[PDB]
Design an enzyme around this catalytic site. Structure first.
Site, PDB file in Angstrom:
ATOM      1  N   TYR A  12       0.789  -1.231   0.000  1.00  0.00           N
ATOM      2  CA  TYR A  12       0.000   0.000   0.000  1.00  0.00           C
ATOM      3  C   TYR A  12       0.825   1.288   0.000  1.00  0.00           C
ATOM      4  CZ  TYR A  12      -3.883  -3.073   1.067  1.00  0.00           C
ATOM      5  OH  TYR A  12      -4.842  -4.053   0.992  1.00  0.00           O
TER       6      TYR A  12
ATOM      7  N   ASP B 237      -5.709  -1.692  12.657  1.00  0.00           N
ATOM      8  CA  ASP B 237      -4.551  -2.431  12.042  1.00  0.00           C
ATOM      9  C   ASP B 237      -3.257  -2.408  12.896  1.00  0.00           C
ATOM     10  OD1 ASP B 237      -3.328  -4.021  10.038  1.00  0.00           O
ATOM     11  OD2 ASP B 237      -2.969  -2.335   8.727  1.00  0.00           O
TER      12      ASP B 237
END
Ligand SMILES: c1ccc2c(-c3cnn4cc(-c5ccc(N6CCNCC6)cc5)cnc34)ccnc2c1
Ligand SMILES: c1ccc2c(-c3cnn4cc(-c5ccc(N6CCNCC6)cc5)cnc34)ccnc2c1
Lengths: 298, 300
Positions: free
Chosen positions: A18, A135
């Site tokens: 990402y 996360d």
């Protein structure tokens, strides 16, 4: 007085699916520049909003400096500029370093303090909504020179306010890291309309990080090698299904090495992990209770 | 002339407009005019929403204002946010209709081009090279630009919402803002709007469109007769009307814009009157779609 876009990118210090993080120079000082893939543009915005509207600021939360975006011709550059931590992530730090009791507790208490600070609503001029991270993992924690840690990567964060009783989940298709996903995320029973559900997912992940750290604390002159959670039952880059079978169907959790049980500190840390790993999310400890427990064992 | 560090290659020349987000400036960039829309930090959600729509939907069409760039820079207690677009020197439809009367050809060209822009926003295209349905949520004559070819384009997607069938998480964003009060549909005003139906938002756009269609039709000359420009409901609400001012006229009183009986002696005005009527049904589901309006106007 200079502009963020004029930060000089010196070297790439981290790179995932990402994005990338670079060490950059701004007026002769190190900063960290996280560069998001255009595909993760909603995470860049969520973080930017959190840092620039809630004004999130705390010794154990990664220090924001600036955010910058420029877009043209379907090309979008997405930068989040933060305090640079040259020791790198906790994941990096645990690979070779071993800990004594003091340094292990300093690490895990600072993470608990960061997370408790996120989870709790604070009232008054210097106040904030409650925030869940979604996360948490050892690659999303930085180690500082003083031995403390700070939590990074708030792009999946969800928020809640007591006065309005409103849950703010934003809209981001990104899901948490599969290795660290709680049972309820993996069997899709998570109650998505309930703010407490997200805090409970963070507590699960925190117990796995606790385990990663405790392995590297010396007792009776020995340590365990660094391993990621579930290293022995799932592959690298495990699939959703790999994790579901292990965590939900087989009801597996990381194992506790025998040597921990003759050390008072590791025995207390094993108990804390168990209290983070209950299948039933409402049975798990809160961040506040975790912080209180750890404050008392040092 | 001024530059800002948020985009050092753009020279701001003059402020040409104000909106609910702030100012729009004529600017110069690499030798061409551009329009620079400047947001306050308060509205960074609308800035991002509009940017994402242009940047990921790759929204493009002759009748949707053309995106050029987006920039933001942010520090503690200082944030600047810009959207850069094509510049249309004729300005907004609202300003144009103050100064200008229309012949039949120009009227049709305007209302067809709005219909075509709106149908392009509204239409969900399915499959691997598809497009979400988009609802505008603040359609009004100030948010439409007149181009030199006599067509218009729709501007300001800061409150726009999107829906693709494939993805299962319907989201009206999280920005604390709704439409211009004067243009709000009855179901918005009496809170009966079916908020969980994406098409409810499309139908709210269709109500606003009928009001714009009335604004335009008023300025078409027919047998030497034309009306002065007036905004919708000008005769029964003050300037800057509240949610409540509007609720009273559209719902409690059931007021609609007046259609002069004289329009029915003109074929074009007659067709337009019928169209407005079918955008203004109290029942949102009875209203025409953007696509059907476009086809009806293409037939004229
Ligand atoms: C998630 C994690 C981090 C960030 C960060 C971020 C801030 N500081 N920082 C430092 C590093 C880093 C420095 C040194 C090393 N090495 C030295 C030891 N031997 C080889 C590796 C490795 C890594 C990486 N990322 C960051 C900034 C913004 N969002 C984030 C989101
Ligand atoms: C809503 C509306 C527009 C925009 C725009 C935008 C793009 N082009 N443009 C041109 C003008 C403008 C030019 C000339 C005049 N006048 C000169 C002739 N006599 C009447 C006054 C007035 C206005 C204003 N805004 C824009 C860009 C981005 N978001 C928007 C959202």
């Amino acid at each position: 007085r200079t502009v963020a876009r004029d930060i000089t990118l010196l070297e790439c210090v981290g790179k995932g699916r990402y994005g990338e993080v670079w060490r950059g120079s701004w007026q002769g000082e190190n900063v960290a520049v996280k560069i998001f893939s255009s595909r993760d543009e909603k995470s860049w915005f969520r973080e930017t909003e959190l840092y620039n509207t809630v004004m999130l600021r705390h010794e154990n939360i990664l220090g924001f400096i600036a955010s910058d975006m420029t877009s043209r011709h379907s090309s979008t550059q997405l930068w989040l500029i933060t305090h640079y931590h040259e020791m790198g992530s906790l994941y990096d730090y645990l690979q070779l370093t071993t800990l004594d009791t003091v340094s292990c507790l300093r690490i895990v208490l600072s993470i608990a303090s960061g997370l408790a600070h996120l989870h709790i609503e604070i009232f008054g001029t210097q106040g904030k909504p409650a925030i869940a991270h979604r996360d948490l993992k050892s690659k999303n924690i930085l180690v500082k020179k003083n031995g403390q840690c700070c939590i990074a990567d708030l792009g999946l964060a969800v928020m809640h306010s007591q006065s309005t009783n409103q849950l703010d989940v934003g809209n981001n298709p990104r899901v948490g890291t599969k290795r660290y996903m709680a049972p309820e995320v993996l069997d899709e029973t998570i109650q998505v309309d309930c703010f407490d559900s997200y805090k409970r997912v963070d507590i699960w992940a925190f117990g796995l990080v606790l385990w990663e750290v405790a392995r590297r604390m010396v007792s009776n002159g020995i340590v365990e090698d660094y391993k990621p959670p579930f290293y022995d039952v799932v592959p690298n880059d495990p699939s959703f299904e790999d994790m579901r079978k292990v965590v939900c169907v087989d009801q597996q959790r990381p194992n506790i090495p025998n040597r921990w049980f003759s050390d008072p500190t590791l025995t207390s840390l094993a108990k804390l992990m168990k209290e983070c790993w209950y299948q039933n999310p409402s049975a798990r400890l809160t961040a506040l209770r975790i912080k209180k427990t750890l404050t008392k064992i040092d």
